[PDB]
């Protein structure tokens, strides 16, 4: 009965169709209040723009007819008699229901009935401006349900064309247009159709139902039925309706039910026409104080896009914010940054992040909403931007609504997702171009170039001055960069950096990192004596020139990309690592990764410490080499042959650590480990993010822990937070861990003067890798800037992008009854590759990280054997087994790992964790070796010698049977390969198999 009542009241009052059941309840409970919630006022603004309490009041007069109040009085008088006239609870309940449907305000005095609400809404509408008079384009018959079919790429602009016929009229909203989706409910479509057909309106408006093919079967059927019913009853005969669908889905329910109404003249408009339309409808009057006053013809909506990453979108938004703070002459201008991370845009989260700004203090104050559409977002962008920028609205299932205010400036930072034209082209677009294009093409705020705050910054100036005096072969000995000084032009700086960057078409991020490295190095130089007219005299000549020529190479190592559908790796060992540091003491200089050798040419060259091959030549002159030798600078050192404590001292010196305490005597401080530690520390110092790619077990966690402990010096303090990222990891979790790490770093820095390290293990195993990109590159958390001067350092670990062998893939597809889904129907995939065919379940890397990722290196057989020996010795320390047993275990486990590595058709992943697991199994069997062997002898005696068994070898055989044997299908080959390392008579595969089988039989017995 109440559903029929609401349908009748909607047919009676037209504006009740602007809102749903819950929204109507909210308005009923809120309109009577004083003042109504800002949310309700916004919801009403979709009828009477800029609705205020005064307007709601002026509309509230005339609604309370004393006829309705007379109904209220007679109800409040009769209801008790009607109740006592009945005795059955059900009868009283029915009477109460009926009397509430007749007069609700009697029961609920703090609420408005549907009649009063409809009247108030109609009054508000009349209190508004002139109505909207839209005329359908040609090919669409007024009074008929014009069905337009087209391509997805044209579904949105087509609708737009329908509303450009009358461009003078304002842009539509949810009242007219509805972007259908599979989750769209019948209520929204019903309200749309009722608004289209029901009578009571004050103008002629078009009503569009876009992507109708996406509506569910039930919803489409209900919409058709409701449309027919509305057509039967009293309605609008000149109703302008459009129904757009995807030609690829013209076979669904709704496009079919109106197939007879299909239209062949699909509306279309030139991109320039749409541009002018949207621009004129976004332009803010000079009198309306808006954030748009500083954006491209006073436009309230903008797009900052780029073909690639690291080009200046967020920087453009920041400079805009600064321009607004400086121009509008207001003390504060909010800047709300919204990061979209979900692959499918979640409009609910954006609406929640926006709601706080519905307050009245913001409805007339400039604001800058910075919507960042990350690379993770794949579907839902066009619909979202159409809803928020053209339809200027957002909504949720609850009922809350958000309206786009012209006083606010919406800026979308999106990477071009490359029809005749792209969607984003319709909006006012600012295309940020990289340096190469910036120097080739070139002022125009639509095509920005090289910022001035950066060009005038030390980071870009000191390297620039040095390189400028370098290419001109000027005397760098006397030159000294003056703080704040500025020279040259952005063009020369760009040219020099591109010449020395080591990259063909770099981004602004790569160039910034190169500049930061060079600047940090040259500054740590100038702070020393070697490059000073005093403390030496003229002993060191060309020192600055050598420093530059070598730091360019160091930066080629620290900045050039290491990654190049799934092809992403170059390697770590294939590249040298010539590192030169200026120690914090300002007295010593550390050299590592290369050896300086003179030659016949009276020059000096850098050669690999391992191969002796030349890395680069003419790095310096023989005179400078001899001078630095006189200065006792370490050259051609072999850190591998040094003592442990000497290595620790040199390392803590380079890192500026004064103490030299070894926190872990087991960690081998080979040259490569120290080089990696120094790379991380340099990236921390110069400000470059640290994103490391390495297999599990390559030694990254251990290295990071060692570095943290070493910088600790023993001081008890949680200076490291190791967050293990998994598929279930979310953005909020990452932000929370980052904030916790920030607080901890503040505490540690103000107590012990230490630096905290937040490490992300397996970062690329979640869809929230964009949050990590923000924490590292953007230096922000959920839109909030990370507090500098916190001593916090972030590290990210990304697993490799590998694919199982075709043989292993076929073996898995053939397991059991095979995968329930096919490799074609799988929704989980990294583009075209199903995630189930990758070794590591990883997700695409944000483009801004790929140039930063580098390889930690694959564990060499030597390191594998050393770690295995360490594990077996740690075991011996408890089980107390002889040396022969240790040797046998080490050999058998190394051989097992080698076999599983060779067997790329059965195993594509090998790590030390499997070794630890096999050791744990061996220990378990050893502890139970006595009882197990006794029961085994008993079980063998029952069913039929003794053949005494060594508990160690027996346990090891069972452990190999559990870990490797069982999983394998080539068990015979594995046994043949592994028995060689077994003592006698256990060097026979058949004996391994027999012992495994006997243990299994015992267990099953
Ligand atoms: N003229 C410039 N344009 C852009 N960036 C510059 C410029 N000069 C220096 N930089 C540095 O380059 C970096 C550019 O980062 P930016 O915020 O533009 O990335 P982005 O455009 O958001 O890319 P993505 O959205 O893919 O991360 C900044 O950290 C900035 O310090
Ligand atoms: Mg950005």
From Swiss-Prot:
This is E3 ubiquitin-protein ligase RNF213. Autoubiquitinated. Widely expressed (at protein level). Monomer. Interacts with UBE2L3/UBCH7; UBE2L3/UBCH7 is the most efficient ubiquitin-conjugating enzyme E2 for the ubiquitin ligase activity. Interacts with UBE2N/UBC13; promoting 'Lys-63'-linked ubiquitination of target proteins. It is linked to Moyamoya disease 2: A progressive cerebral angiopathy characterized by bilateral intracranial carotid artery stenosis and telangiectatic vessels in the region of the basal ganglia. The abnormal vessels resemble a 'puff of smoke' (moyamoya) on cerebral angiogram. Affected individuals can develop transient ischemic attacks and/or cerebral infarction, and rupture of the collateral vessels can cause intracranial hemorrhage. Hemiplegia of sudden onset and epileptic seizures constitute the prevailing presentation in childhood, while subarachnoid bleeding occurs more frequently in adults. Changing residue 762 to Q: Loss of ATPase hydrolysis. It comes from the Eukaryota. It comes from Homo sapiens (Human). The gene is RNF213. The chain holds residues 1686 to 2734 of 5207 of the full protein. Induction: Down-regulated by let-7c miRNA, which binds to the 3'-UTR transcript of RNF213. Induced by pro-inflammatory cytokines. (Microbial infection) Up-regulated in macrophages infected by M.tuberculosis. Belongs to the AAA ATPase family. ATP binds at residues 310-315, 413, 451, 512, 773, 848. Composed of an N-terminal stalk, a dynein-like core comprised of two catalytically active and four inactive ATPase domains, and a C-terminal E3 module. The ATPase regions do not generate movement but rather act like an intricate molecular 'switch'. The RING-type zinc finger domain is required for the ubiquitin-protein ligase activity. Atypical E3 ubiquitin ligase that can catalyze ubiquitination of both proteins and lipids, and which is involved in various processes, such as lipid metabolism, angiogenesis and cell-autonomous immunity. Acts as a key immune sensor by catalyzing ubiquitination of the lipid A moiety of bacterial lipopolysaccharide (LPS) via its RZ-type zinc-finger: restricts the proliferation of cytosolic bacteria, such as Salmonella, by generating the bacterial ubiquitin coat through the ubiquitination of LPS. It is found in: Cytoplasm, Cytosol; Lipid droplet.
